[PDB]
Design a protein around this ligand. Structure first.
Ligand SMILES: [K+]
Ligand SMILES: [K+]
Ligand SMILES: [K+]
Ligand SMILES: [K+]
Ligand SMILES: [K+]
Ligand SMILES: [K+]
Ligand SMILES: [K+]
Ligand SMILES: [K+]
Ligand SMILES: [K+]
Ligand SMILES: [K+]
Ligand SMILES: [K+]
Ligand SMILES: [K+]
Ligand SMILES: [K+]
Ligand SMILES: [K+]
Ligand SMILES: [K+]
Ligand SMILES: [K+]
Ligand SMILES: [K+]
Ligand SMILES: [K+]
Ligand SMILES: [K+]
Ligand SMILES: [K+]
Ligand SMILES: [K+]
Ligand SMILES: [Mg+2]
Ligand SMILES: [Mg+2]
Ligand SMILES: [Mg+2]
Ligand SMILES: [Mg+2]
Ligand SMILES: [Mg+2]
Ligand SMILES: [Mg+2]
Ligand SMILES: [Mg+2]
Ligand SMILES: [Mg+2]
Ligand SMILES: [Mg+2]
Ligand SMILES: [Mg+2]
Ligand SMILES: [Mg+2]
Ligand SMILES: [Mg+2]
Ligand SMILES: [Mg+2]
Ligand SMILES: [Mg+2]
Ligand SMILES: [Mg+2]
Ligand SMILES: [Mg+2]
Ligand SMILES: [Mg+2]
Ligand SMILES: [Mg+2]
Ligand SMILES: [Mg+2]
Ligand SMILES: [Mg+2]
Ligand SMILES: [Mg+2]
Ligand SMILES: [Mg+2]
Ligand SMILES: [Mg+2]
Ligand SMILES: [Mg+2]
Ligand SMILES: [Mg+2]
Ligand SMILES: [Mg+2]
Ligand SMILES: [Zn+2]
Lengths: 48, 57, 134, 74
RNA sequence: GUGGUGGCGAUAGCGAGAAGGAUACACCUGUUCCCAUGCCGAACACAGAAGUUAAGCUUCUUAGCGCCGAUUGUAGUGAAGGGUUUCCCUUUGUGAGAGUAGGACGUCGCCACG
RNA sequence: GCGGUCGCCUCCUAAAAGGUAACGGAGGCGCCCAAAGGUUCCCUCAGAAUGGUUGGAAAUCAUUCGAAGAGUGUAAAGGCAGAAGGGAGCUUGACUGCGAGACCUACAAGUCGAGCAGGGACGAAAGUCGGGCUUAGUGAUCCGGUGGUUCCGCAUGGAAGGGCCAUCGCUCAACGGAUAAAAGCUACCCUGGGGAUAACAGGCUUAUCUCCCCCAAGAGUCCACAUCGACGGGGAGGUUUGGCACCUCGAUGUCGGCUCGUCGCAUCCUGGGGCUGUAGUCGGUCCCAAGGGUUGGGCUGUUCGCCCAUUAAAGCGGCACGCG
RNA sequence: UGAUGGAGGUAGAGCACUGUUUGGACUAGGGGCCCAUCUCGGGUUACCGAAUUCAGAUAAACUCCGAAUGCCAUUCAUUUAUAUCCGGGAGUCAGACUGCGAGUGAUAAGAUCCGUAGUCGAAAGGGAAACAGCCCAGACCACCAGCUAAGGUCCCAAAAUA
């Protein structure tokens, strides 16, 4: 089951990115180091 | 040197390219005559509509 | 004669123009039947000509059928209006263009060969003539 | 049941050999690299050949059996 | 001459045969070293210079294959016409593919050691 | 009408730019991947022969040949072996703000994009990276949900409620989406139009149909051709079953019968003739021949057809399937 | 219109790929026949025969190749006179046939659907007997003048009993 997901910056809680993932292949919340435009630096974003 | 070209055939029922060639040569009504230089371009136009015109030196 | 397999169930009727591309000379047999006109030839016509030729030859000698009915043609049943897709395949044909050597024969005297080819020609729909090997 | 077909994608050459084009002009639309990008030419994500800089378009042959597009500024 | 390194559509290739290592390149000896194999110092990496042109590589011969390929003719066809018009023919211009005559066992550069 | 179809991608049709229709010929899509993305490094396949425990055509291994005959998540086309294919390490550029200029295009959209800035991944560096070899994997607005926001806040401060930004809720698949919300009968029917469009007749076509031929394997005791003639081939006719939709829908009356006929000949009888597997009487087949003639009933609306009884014969067709 | 340079895979042709395919050679191998059966090893049909090879075909959805044309472009050349853009006003969205290239159809249709050029539509005049779409040719008018196109010249009926 592949679903659209939102990656939110952990630092400022800003829903910066939209992506998608297969729940079965990745049961746990995804986490990626992405650039947060609000904070203007690379931060850890975790699916919401 | 020179080419005296006379239109001996109607342009009705002819391809638009041939009609445009006649117009570019500057011929009008049937039997309309013009004189042009003997350039390669002019001779090419004459060859294109050879079946509609008669050419003299 | 029918192809074992076909890439496409249905096919264009096509167009025949000019001399045949190849096979305009007798290759295997001593004598051959050359088409002087272009026309479709059905597997039925090919078979009829072949049977006539063999029967007159008394199975003495060898016969080659140079042409093969690769193409298929469809049709629509009576009472079927135009449209609703192409018709179901009906028969098989070989587009034969003038100059094609449809049949060849060998291992028989000249008169027997000429008579056998004459019978085959009357079975076929194209005008033909006899051609000897070179 | 037949009767389906996609919209034509207007592929092919969009600039003539010997033509002057502004930088970034699309020169050739293609599926795959039917023609390769040459001098001052880039290839887009969908294989489209575009001019990097202003210049004259030239279609050369890349070796024995491959074509190529270059843009030569004047 | 050899080693690097490039340009030009293989006319630069392939096959076959032959000669050479002066240097050079090579095989070649090892795994202590950085480095490594989903096992193997075979590879890659490193150290070294006993032996050998055997192979690679360079040079040379070879038209067997591959490659290039004129001319002529023809198919097709633009244009103008004709015919008995699913097709065919004439004039004019263009003109292949194929088959061939032949060409070709490469050439044009730069660097270093000789 | 029934069946099929409706949006998007690929090929052929498509006539060597592009585009190009048909209820034309073929297939696919409504996803998938946390790597099957990025980068650095490295690697080259499918098959075949030969040899080899279980092991056999074919599991795994080795040598050789092997230029792609493999693979490329997923259809096809194009492309890729200087890889876009395969393996490993590290990573998240499957980045943010954009964007000269282009392609496509009625609009809405769609596509490509160097380059600039911010801050990064890989790599020594060059440099590559704004997803995947490319091209489908999608849906306008309205309305609503969620998060953010230095925006507004109906006297003022708040609030309520909005705006902006981000994103979610479409088989609105009839896929440019009528409405938040909808199936049928009409022969009780009615109106406005159309010969733009069917049924009758005409027209065109002649596949089918009727008729006539070609070849002659054969049947005919022998013997292709007295007679019949397979497998095939070629025509004529315009009476059949059809195809098209050209006149007529501000009306061209439809079957059968009756009355009246008239014409064609591919002749049912009568007339002339050739051949005969013609002894004779009968015939068979073919040729010429359209002058005349070619029936009365039972059944059925019938045409047709069967039957009864006759006749020299009980012809086949056209004439708006002649003639309201 | 010429010159020059390009993009592209059609006609044609070809078999280098993929399909379809014919004959020959050879045969892996499969077949039934007998011996040998532990069904084991032959010996067979010019038995059938894969793949290979030779020769020969074939293709809208094959291509080692590949035109003529058309197309794009050039501060180019000759001739010519339109092209853009901005705005006011429209009508058109039933087309027809003819020639050529295709599909559908039956290589039928005055059929249907495209591409392409012409004409009709919206075009009178001459020819084709009559005959929108074919051939010749574009009517501003007057003439009891002349020359020609297609097509014609024995009579209807102008012109050759050339
Ligand atoms: K015949
Ligand atoms: K070593
Ligand atoms: K050596
Ligand atoms: K060579
Ligand atoms: K990787
Ligand atoms: K709709
Ligand atoms: K009723
Ligand atoms: K009627
Ligand atoms: K007929
Ligand atoms: K006849
Ligand atoms: K007899
Ligand atoms: K009516
Ligand atoms: K008689
Ligand atoms: K009579
Ligand atoms: K009755
Ligand atoms: K009658
Ligand atoms: K009445
Ligand atoms: K082939
Ligand atoms: K083709
Ligand atoms: K205007
Ligand atoms: K047309
Ligand atoms: Mg397409
Ligand atoms: Mg992409
Ligand atoms: Mg040649
Ligand atoms: Mg074209
Ligand atoms: Mg095209
Ligand atoms: Mg990949
Ligand atoms: Mg207030
Ligand atoms: Mg719609
Ligand atoms: Mg009632
Ligand atoms: Mg009414
Ligand atoms: Mg009316
Ligand atoms: Mg009508
Ligand atoms: Mg009528
Ligand atoms: Mg119509
Ligand atoms: Mg009336
Ligand atoms: Mg008679
Ligand atoms: Mg009647
Ligand atoms: Mg009446
Ligand atoms: Mg062809
Ligand atoms: Mg029509
Ligand atoms: Mg009108
Ligand atoms: Mg007129
Ligand atoms: Mg009128
Ligand atoms: Mg005169
Ligand atoms: Mg007179
Ligand atoms: Mg005379
Ligand atoms: Zn943040």
């Amino acid at each position: 089951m592949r679903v659209n997901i939102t990656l939110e910056c952990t630092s400022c809680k800003e829903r910066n990115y939209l992506t998608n993932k297969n729940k079965r292949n990745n049961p746990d919340r995804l986490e990626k180091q992405k650039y947060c435009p609000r904070e203007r630096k690379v931060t850890l974003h975790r699916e919401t | 040197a020179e080419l005296k070209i006379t239109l001996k055939r109607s342009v009705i029922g002819r391809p638009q390219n041939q009609r445009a060639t006649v117009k570019a040569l500057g011929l009008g009504k049937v039997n309309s005559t013009v004189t042009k230089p003997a350039n390669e371009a002019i001779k090419g136009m004459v060859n294109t509509i050879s079946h509609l015109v008669d050419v003299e030196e | 004669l029918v192809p074992k397999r076909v890439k496409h169930r249905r096919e264009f009727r096509g167009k025949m123009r000019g001399e045949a591309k190849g096979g305009k000379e007798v290759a295997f047999g001593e004598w051959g039947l050359q088409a002087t006109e272009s026309h479709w030839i059905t597997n039925r016509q090919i078979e009829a000509a072949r049977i006539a030729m063999t029967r007159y030859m008394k199975r003495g000698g060898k016969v080659w059928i140079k042409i093969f009915p690769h193409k298929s043609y469809t049709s629509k049943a009576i009472g079927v209006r135009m449209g609703k897709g192409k018709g179901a395949p009906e028969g098989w044909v070989s587009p034969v263009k003038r100059g094609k050597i449809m049949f060849e024969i060998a291992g028989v005297p000249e008169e027997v060969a000429r008579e056998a080819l004459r019978l085959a020609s009357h079975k076929l729909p194209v005008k033909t003539k006899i051609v000897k090997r070179e | 049941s037949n009767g389906r077909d996609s919209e034509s994608k207007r592929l092919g050459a969009k600039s003539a050999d010997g033509q002057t084009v502004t930088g970034g002009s699309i020169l050739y639309r293609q599926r795959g690299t039917k023609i390769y990008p040459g001098v001052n030419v880039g290839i887009g994500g969908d294989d489209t050949l575009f001019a990097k800089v202003d210049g004259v378009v030239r279609f050369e042959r890349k070796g024995r059996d491959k074509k190529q597009v270059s843009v030569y500024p004047v």
